[PDB]
Amino acid sequence: LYAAAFSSDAADAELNWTNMVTFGDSNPNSITNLPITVLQLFQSKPNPDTNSTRDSPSF
Amino acid sequence: LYAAAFSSDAADAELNWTNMVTFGDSNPNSITNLPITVLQLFQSKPNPDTNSTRDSPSFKTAFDTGRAALGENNVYASRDPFDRPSADARYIAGGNAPAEVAGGSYLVDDGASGSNGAFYFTISFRVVPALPGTYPRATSEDQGNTDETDDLVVRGDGRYAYPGVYTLNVKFVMVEC
Amino acid sequence: NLISEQNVTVTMDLQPVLQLGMQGSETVSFVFSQISEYIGGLTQYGAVDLSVSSTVDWCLYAAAFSSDAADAELNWTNMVTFGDSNPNSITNLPITVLQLFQSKPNPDTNSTRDSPSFKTAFDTGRAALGENNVYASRDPFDRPSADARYIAGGNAPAEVAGGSYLVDDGASGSNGAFYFTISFRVVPALPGTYPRATSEDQGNTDETDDLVVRGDGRYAYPGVYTLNVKFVMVEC
Amino acid sequence: NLISEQNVTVTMDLQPVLQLGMQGSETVSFVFSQISEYIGGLTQYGAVDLSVSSTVDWCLYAAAFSSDAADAELNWTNMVTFGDSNPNSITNLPITVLQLFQSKPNPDTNSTRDSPSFKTAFDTGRAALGENNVYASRDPFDRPSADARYIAGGNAPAEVAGGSYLVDDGASGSNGAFYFTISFRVVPALPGTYPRATSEDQGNTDETDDLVVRGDGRYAYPGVYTLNVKFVMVEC
Secondary structure, three states: OOOOOOOHHHHOOOOEOOOOOOOOOOOOOOOOOOEHHHOOOOOOOOOOOOOOOOOOOOO | OEEEEEOHHHHOOOOEOEEEEEOOOOOOOEEOOOEHHHOEEEOOOOOOOOOOOOOOOOOOOOOOOOOOOOOOOEOEEOOOOOOOOOOOOOEOOOOOOOOOOOOOOOOOOEOEOHHHOOOOOOOEEEOOOOOOOOOOOOEOOOOOOOOOEOOHHHHHOOOEEOOEEEEEEEEEEOEOO | OOEOOEEEEEEEEEOOOEEEEEOOOOOOOOOOOOHHHHHHOEEEEEEEEEEEEEOOOEEEEEEEEOHHHHOOOOEOEEEEEOOOOOOOEEOOOEHHHOEEEEOOOOOOOOOOOOOOOOOOOOOOOOOOOOOOEOEEOOOOOOOOOOOOOEEEOOOOOOOEOOEEOOOOEOEOHHHOOOEEEEEEEEOOOOOOOOOOOEOOOOOOOOOEOOHHHHHOOOEEOOEEEEOEEEEEEEEO | OOOOOOOOOOOOOOOOOEEEEEOOOOOOOOOOOOHHHHHHOEEEEEEEEEEEEEOOOEEEEEEEEOHHHHOOOOEOEEEEEOOOOOOOEEOOOEHHHOEEEOOOOOOOOOOOOOOOOOOOOOOOOOOOOOOOEOEEOOOOOOOOOOOOOEEEOOOOOOOEOOEEOOOOEOEOHHHOOOEEEEEEEEOOOOOOOOOOOEOOOOOOOOOEOOHHHHHOOOEEOOEEEEOEEEEEEEEO
16 A cells, blocks of 8 residues: 655646646746645555665655 | 437437526525536547547647637537437537548557557546626537637526536447538 | 337426625624714725626615614614713614725626615715615515615616526626625714714615704714624515 | 665755734724824834744835726725815825835845935925835835845845844844834925925935826815735845
């Protein structure tokens, strides 16, 4: 069992949140390209069986 | 495989959402006539085999923002959805001509299996009105696949959707090639 | 054409979202302690900032109210009286004592009596009598008549298009027709009456309703009075 | 790879939170009772203390206003007149008469005329004429021009980064660029004119707008006048 983040922009190879509207007027230094990995998940139990290499093998 | 939008009003040749009740008191500029193509579908995989003429031959294009796309995700609106769609409609897997995907199952593998095969599709729905009340992303009923607006301002130039309950049917038809 | 279909039902529920936000204190308190406070009156600018969002065409209006007004007596609700006694000192104050001033003009309106909005400048003396007085009503949950005072809209289908103060269609933010700042004024006089009060035909007429109208020599009895002002956004 | 999946849709609503708090009285009262008050003027330090929080880069400015100003006449709103009468006593006082003084310098600004902020010291006499006068406008809800008087920011994308006076990034608390204490001053003169008023080109010019400019021999009519000062934080 795993959890994968996704979006239509991600389906088009751009791992971003899908924008729908922009509150405000404007500013050049305001990009509507947010990373998908902004969200964080926390698990309840530990992983019963895992063998991974990088950082933590579970949430 | 294709997806067709439908309703009883559509069965009576008027491609509209079926109203059930109206919230509020009243207003002359409030119509219970919404385009069927208001809904937008987004496909997961690209179309394995397709050859179309108008706009995009599938729902693979990403969910665009504002009145920019106008046709890349709108549902195929039809009044008689049991006949195979014409050569320029939007299929999910295949096309009007013998441009199709071979027979098989999502259970046994010939190449890839499971959700990686061409026998499994996940579809995302979107409906986006605008606070002016219209639907900027609706397209006209040429075939549901054109870059021509069908907002409520097209009907009256100053009307908004009348608050209430509306109902639409989406049927995913798997026809033989 | 042999097929195998699966049908999903989409049930869209277009609810009538009307959202009026306020960026001021719920309680607006006038404390008349100084002589100048009595003679010149008290004014609080920008006491209420209304931000508007609506799905449908809307009309915004301000209606004054009170429990006494709910019982058909358009008066301030007394709570206590300071002092000992005087025959010519009545605790019956008119609701139209309060005056509101609007920041923007009314985008779309037509009316018959005086000004259809609170845009008029705060006049001095008993010269205006009706260009800023509140819409005093005993039942403010029905839409006001054609000659009342609306803040944004009118009785007829003279309204402003649905939208929000967040996203831009033309102008955005506080420049749009979806943001209004309202100033309050209450001005008594040294004799004790309220020269700027108007009679309660609809609150929008040039007929004075001072305490002398009640008794010809009456002044306000010192004490605590309470009045309600509700800003109603009603669909058109 | 046969699977069975369940999908959740996450909808983050990034709203433009702009939060301006103040730790002073809403009503600031100037009571000129003694001769020295008329001659030297009245000054109140630390009348308001603005604390700022914002999601987006912002510009803070202070704009004077009134109902007369809302009707395109930048004047104090009169309410009552003390005295009997005199031909040379006009109740039309300039809005730019009030003077604001800032505590911190302007963190980032590029302006055209005179000073870009209220940081200059309270000068004595008709010597400064524009280094402290308020930005007087009839429509203060649209962003001021490139040569007006901002408090923290400017018309162009010259601004201060989003943040709060609570959490620290560099400095925190009252030492950051998110906290400003503002002093007020109004100085009349014994002749009755107001020598520190400037003409309303933008409220920021070295051209006097005394009552002698109106009439060359009129002094202020004793009475009660009211003016509004609104501190606006606008997005950049």
